């Protein structure tokens, strides 16, 4: 019945366990025009990112920490197989070509789309930062200390609010479930 505080819930989701502390947030479609879906680099913070870099952009992609780049087309290797691993990003030139292949990325949630900051010319800066109207966000672990998830939820809430959606009218906040 009682709404706890932020300084209490970080110390208490220690006790709700090495598990991962995640946050749900009910948003306030009618408002799809100014919907609230997104990604931001995190403060208090293993992935396997595979890139689709084209041209010279592969040359800076092999030194940042990526596992496999490609031989400029391995979607034929993606056809009939392809246990995908963690994250797929791309570049704004071959995205259309990969896209015209079908929904091998539709119901699997890895389709490159430049609304998320994942399809850009800065592939070296993109590898290094990734490593019904609702958003899910993993802010961290159980084993993090009490001062880590406070900055993590603060950064994510300031990101949500920094993004005060248009048609701001009416309540924006409905629920925080830590």
């Amino acid at each position: 019945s009682k709404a706890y505080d932020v300084s209490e819930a970080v110390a208490l989701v220690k006790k709700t366990n090495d598990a991962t502390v995640e946050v749900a947030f009910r948003l306030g479609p009618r408002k799809n025009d100014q919907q609230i879906r997104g990604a931001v680099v995190l403060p208090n913070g293993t992935q396997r990112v595979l890139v689709f870099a084209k041209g010279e952009k592969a040359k800076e992609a092999e030194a940042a920490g990526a596992d496999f780049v490609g031989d400029t087309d391995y979607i034929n290797k993606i056809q009939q197989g392809w246990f995908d691993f963690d994250v797929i990003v791309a570049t704004p030139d071959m995205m259309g070509e990969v896209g015209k292949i079908g929904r091998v990325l539709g119901p699997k949630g890895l389709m490159p789309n430049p609304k998320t900051g994942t399809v850009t010319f800065e592939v070296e800066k993109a590898i290094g930062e990734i490593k019904a109207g609702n958003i899910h966000v993993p802010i961290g672990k159980v084993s993090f200390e009490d001062e880590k998830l406070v900055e993590n939820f603060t950064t994510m809430y300031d990101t949500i609010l920094k993004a005060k959606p248009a048609a701001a009218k009416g309540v924006y906040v409905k629920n925080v479930a830590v």
Binding site: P29, N32, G96, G99, G102, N113, A132
Partner: protein
């Protein structure tokens, strides 16, 4: 022949596309509420191929959506429009749920992309798990070639109209005629929005009935270009030759509604509805019979018919009435016989400074029309013109149709 249908959500350029395929009958505005409210048919042409097209809609929402499901099944291939600018919405999956259980072919389309730079952002549209999206634009004719082929891949008389004022029962009238649920009926005025085609055969004879959603007072039409729908009624009148008028068992606008039809040179028939509502006993019909005769005198040839949609009485007599008006509206006469009687009229009325009559002949057969060769075109009097009119309408039938009369000079 193959039948194609388009479904979707409010604001997806559907009616717009359908119009761009062929014609502009479909009403187009910019707002959430104003959408095509029911099925409508047409014809198309794409190579040897010649399929049709079914247009659907996005208060009362259950009915139209149900009507859309009716279309859904009896269709051959499915066109599923969706917007491109704002990505994926809740309503998209909502409709996708029924599409998944709809064991029919699906071709997806993406609108609102009218420039090359906007052609992208299609990868995101891979959720449906359907085939390849093909962008299209409404303002411009972009990307339609790929779409049509996408459809062609799976691809293997008289007309009369009914008009009136809103909230009279005109929609109930039609559906009952066919005996089929075809158009939406509601107790609120102006439920229907735009004209709907319906083709059917009666007694080895095919017919085409049309609705016009009723019309309010001419000063009473102040809305978000709902005149844009009113004009569609006007075009419909031009399309067909016979008009039936429906009054509920009299207001001057009903006379004004009959105004456009009479001047149009189109046969017009008087019909009443809801006869069950009023008292129904001996000699009741006379009161209305002379009231309409007294009110309406600039028309006389219109026969009077009685029907009640709810109880479905006398509805059989309505159709035949229409056929009789047809040939009357398309009938020529022997010029010898016509001029044979013109003089008898002048013999009995030798008081036309004096007009002279020499000749009269039928020229326009589409609508009973003729021309008289007199000495002085100015010397006439409209009453005398009204005199020669009745005489001819009494020599022969010419009933249920108007007559236009012309008077050329001697020359």
């Amino acid at each position: 022949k193959p039948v194609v249908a388009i479904v979707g959500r409010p604001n997806v350029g559907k009616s717009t596309i359908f119009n761009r395929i062929a014609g502009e009958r479909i009403s187009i505005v910019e707002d959430t509420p104003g959408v095509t409210r029911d099925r409508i048919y047409s014809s198309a042409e794409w190579l040897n191929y010649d399929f049709n097209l079914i247009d659907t809609g996005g208060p009362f929402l259950t009915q139209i959506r149900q009507q859309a499901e009716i279309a859904m099944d009896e269709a051959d291939v499915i066109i599923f429009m969706v917007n491109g600018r704002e990505g994926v919405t809740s309503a998209d999956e909502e409709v996708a749920k029924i599409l998944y259980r709809t064991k029919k072919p699906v071709v997806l389309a993406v609108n609102k992309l009218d420039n090359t730079e906007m052609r992208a952002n299609i990868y995101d549209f891979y959720s449906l798990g359907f085939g390849e999206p093909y962008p299209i634009s409404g303002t411009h004719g972009l990307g339609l070639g790929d779409l049509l082929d996408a459809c062609a891949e799976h691809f293997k008389v008289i007309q009369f109209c009914l008009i009136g004022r809103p909230n009279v029962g005109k929609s109930s009238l039609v559906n009952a005629m066919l005996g089929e649920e075809r158009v939406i009926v509601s107790n609120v005025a102006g439920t229907t929005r735009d004209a709907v085609d319906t083709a059917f055969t009666y007694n080895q004879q095919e017919f085409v009935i049309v609705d016009t959603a009723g019309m309010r007072k001419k000063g009473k039409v102040y809305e978000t270009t709902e005149k844009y729908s009113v004009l569609r009624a006007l075009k419909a009148i031009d399309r067909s030759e016979v008009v039936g008028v429906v009054l509920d068992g009299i207001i001057e606008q009903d006379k004004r509604i009959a105004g456009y039809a009479h001047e149009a040179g189109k046969a017009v028939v008087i019909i009443v509805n809801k006869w069950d509502a009023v008292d129904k006993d001996e000699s009741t019909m006379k009161e209305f019979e002379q009231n309409i005769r007294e009110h309406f005198q600039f028309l006389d040839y219109a026969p009077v018919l009685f029907m009640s949609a709810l109880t479905k009485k006398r509805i059989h007599t309505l159709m035949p009435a229409i056929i009789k008006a047809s040939e009357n509206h398309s009938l020529r006469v022997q010029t010898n016989v016509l001029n044979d009687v013109i003089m008898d009229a002048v013999a009995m009325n030798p008081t036309p400074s004096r007009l002279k009559i020499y000749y009269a002949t039928q020229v326009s057969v589409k609508p009973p029309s003729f021309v008289v060769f007199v000495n002085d075109p100015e010397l006439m009097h409209f009453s005398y013109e009204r005199f020669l009119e009745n005489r001819i309408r009494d020599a022969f039938g010419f009933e249920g149709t108007p007559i236009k009369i012309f008077a050329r000079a001697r020359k």
